[PDB]
Amino acid sequence: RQMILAVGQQGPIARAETREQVVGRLLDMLTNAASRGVNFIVFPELALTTFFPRWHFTDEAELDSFYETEMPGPVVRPLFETAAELGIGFNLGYAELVVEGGVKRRFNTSILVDKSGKIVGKYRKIHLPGHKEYEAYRPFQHLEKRYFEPGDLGFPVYDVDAAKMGMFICNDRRWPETWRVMGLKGAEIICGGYNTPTHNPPVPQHDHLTSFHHLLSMQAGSYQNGAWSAAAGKVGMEEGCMLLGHSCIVAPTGEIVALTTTLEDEVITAALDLDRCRELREHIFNFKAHRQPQHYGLIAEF
Amino acid sequence: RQMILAVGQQGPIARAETREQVVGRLLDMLTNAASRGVNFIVFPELALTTFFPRWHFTDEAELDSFYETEMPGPVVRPLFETAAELGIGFNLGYAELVVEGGVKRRFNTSILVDKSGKIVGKYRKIHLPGHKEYEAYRPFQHLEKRYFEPGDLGFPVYDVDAAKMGMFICNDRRWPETWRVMGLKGAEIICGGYNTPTHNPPVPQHDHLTSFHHLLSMQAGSYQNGAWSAAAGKVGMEEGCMLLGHSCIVAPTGEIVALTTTLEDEVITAALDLDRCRELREHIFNFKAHRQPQHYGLIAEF
Amino acid sequence: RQMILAVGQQGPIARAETREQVVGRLLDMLTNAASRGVNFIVFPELALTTFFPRWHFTDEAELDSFYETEMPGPVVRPLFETAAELGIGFNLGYAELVVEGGVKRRFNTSILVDKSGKIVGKYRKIHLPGHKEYEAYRPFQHLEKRYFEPGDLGFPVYDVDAAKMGMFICNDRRWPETWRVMGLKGAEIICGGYNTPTHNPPVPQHDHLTSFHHLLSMQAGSYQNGAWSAAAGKVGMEEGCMLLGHSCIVAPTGEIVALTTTLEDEVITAALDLDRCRELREHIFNFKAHRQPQHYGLIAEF
């Protein structure tokens, strides 16, 4: 019931930095994690490449090179190998390209890999942020709705070694429903990655609130569902776009218990007691005692 | 589209203090609000009496004296008369007793009164915190489940002068569902009152997080639905129980724009621009664009 | 002993925008203040012009036109006349040019004007941020050390109507010495303006902390000296440079009691009770009971 959770924040991944170069950066973090008694580490969203949805692509082949067609392929394999021989689980985000009867499905995906190196769960991003068309005035695009489709796995919770773990991806953390669906399935840890620019072209009047909104989302989510949470950023200046840092780990009371302070590759860690979830879920947010779903119907109407 | 919103926090209300004496304290806060240009003021939950759910009543007549059988009665009419003279809307919380079909219904209620002095809408607390039977191992009782039954009006949003306003009551502001049903109805302002002790007998290890949790709830709710909000506390040491202060007014971005600093009757105000809601709702939380209600059905299961 | 204090935040002042146009904006904030019961309003640093220290100047006369030689001149007079007509006091920031003994002295200055329109006191910025020579790596210079010389008035505290008021200017708020010198002179209100860019050329890894460090400074300084404080930003996108919003009013406990949420001209207000300073200064920070100046001599060495 007690474990050490970590977050492996990434600094920038350049457009032509290789997957072999990224994996090497991930392995060094696993190594750092293992010297600090870590048992599970969270890596960022789209952790194997630069954040490619910042450009408008005119070439499908070029677009497809940023997606994984297997997991892991030969180059990502050492990550898996290293993490199991260290006996450390991990959450990895990546772009997923699958071919169904000749039709190409694209997803922004994350997976949970237990301490033995078994993939025990997958999640695909349901809330895809940004815009649809190329928008000339932006200094950088945000075309996730063009490069991915909404996930089709719902928000699942999985058994990973001792814990019940749910996943979120980036913008999903901002929606109370993401958290609540996994809270209703008894997640003890909700975790995921993000790439969050500190400039937003259509509403630049919120730019100086980027960290505030990120942390607000993580603290409320955890508190409302009594779940430990963790958010691992890919951060700093990547291809000219400044990505938010403040990767974090948060208690079931919404307290931030660990926080990064660099914009580089950085491992933060926190001791997690999975029975601490009880302080909320057996008390103020004891859902059978207090929740009232018969009056929340509008939320699930579509 | 622009208004000055206030919160009229109350300091304690002794069990012996009369409704006439309380009403005189509410009047003095409307005079203050008038002096600062206020157009609408939010008063606390159960604002006419001490917080009677802290005791276990055996005398049903004694329990009934804390309820209102009409709104306003004679004792509460001067509040209505003076607010309608000054042109100020208000939100008032009070304990309501209504007989229907052979049942004496008891509800923890709030109403919205417009600047003409008309009662435009009611809400009756849906999430009742605490417990139903006397519990000897707690130092003070929290018998809201025994003295009230959950509201039967859903979470409605009403036009009040120029604004779409929704109400919550106390513990409701902790549940993201509360805010999201009203957000989906296009509430611009969401407001209500509270009595929140700073000591929680069953989980006293969260007592120094009382203010944190209260503010976290208001900030995240406002942010997620792009709504201004306001919470009016009844605060300080009331009958030997300390109630949290930190009454507040919050912008649509989650920023706290006004906060009380005393534990006495105290008026705080803020400038509200109802078009600021679009900064979130036509953008990051543009629901038609990004919300995914098709994957949230677990939230509404009962 | 009780008043309503206001902050008058300015959005951007263009390079071609006139002193007459900038005074009409100030005047509109004064009347918005008067409708909300305000007795004193704080305006930003260098409130009459754009923030000219972002540029390297070659033509002295060109530089000199940004400075005041009189306070007020014919164009700034109506601000003083209207403020005294409404009976509101104000803090105004502006660039001052004084020729004395063959030396052209340039100061970044602020004045207190009481409700009757009397200039009661001046302060000249002591801590000038930035650099003294043009530096090539910045999109905007920060030449305060070239365009100004450090103030020669110390950190004075003045009587202004009922209150003991001290002034700071911009970066001064970051030094605990600023606040403490005024606290040791009894200041009850410490106030001043700022122009703070949300990008810091030499340590851009702290840009997402801009609001955090501005508010941290204001809360700590207030708390430590048991003083109300107020900071008025000149904010938003100015001449290509984005300046931080979050103008604020803070209580003697360090609580933020009012905060701006727009990057445009905006008035915020708060009730101030000059006797609340005692909660801190007769108790935890009772300087005669607890301060130990015998061990602080290194702070004053030079």
Next chain:
Amino acid sequence: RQMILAVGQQGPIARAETREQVVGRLLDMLTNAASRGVNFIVFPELALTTFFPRWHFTDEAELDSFYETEMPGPVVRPLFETAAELGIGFNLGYAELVVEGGVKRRFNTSILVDKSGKIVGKYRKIHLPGHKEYEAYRPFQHLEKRYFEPGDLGFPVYDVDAAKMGMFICNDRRWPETWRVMGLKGAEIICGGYNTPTHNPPVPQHDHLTSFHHLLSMQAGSYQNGAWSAAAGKVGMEEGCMLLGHSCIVAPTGEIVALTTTLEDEVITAALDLDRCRELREHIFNFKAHRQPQHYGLIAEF
């Protein structure tokens, strides 16, 4: 220059819990620390016994029994032996009793012990909080001024293995002067321990800000001097008095990087890069470039 720093918070220490028992608890935290790669661990103020200044003592022998006459004694020795075996330095707080020509001196002290087990520095509390004579209404007393005299070593900074470290004890963290004296001496880490009740009898209206004021002091102190910091609480319900938790580690930007979330013995850790102090100290708070001590003379008047 890189290290793993920790805080060993303590849960309650009963009046008759023996030093052997406390030492045993300390040893358990050192094991935990070692498993997380820690190099240095900070323990609380007065970490060997219950917080004995809460009571009125009338017997000298009774008071004396809570003081160390040697450091370490036999019972405390195994803390030093294990720490040194593990290669972990530590900061320990304890009550010091020394007899100088028949006169008893009493200090509330803390020592820095390097990874070899050598005591390399001591500090004695300079700002003793609380009242000087018994005050009947208080539920618990705060008689530090009676049981200790103010320290006589000023605020020293010492070399501890790779690092420059300064100490503070409890209420000392609230005075900007504590932090500034050690920042002016180059401290890279400023650390120390505390016992902070969440109820304050004379000003109970700040009790819901107890965590707020603690963290604010820590964040502000660190940010202004460019130092990593750490505060180690002895927390929870000790002899009927609830002590604040929220032990923390803080970066030189004032960001909290590690926070405790229980009110029991707990170890938190953070990676520290002693070269990070430069982000502030070479730039915004470049003392040589920016500070003006010539106008800070009132701070040192006495």
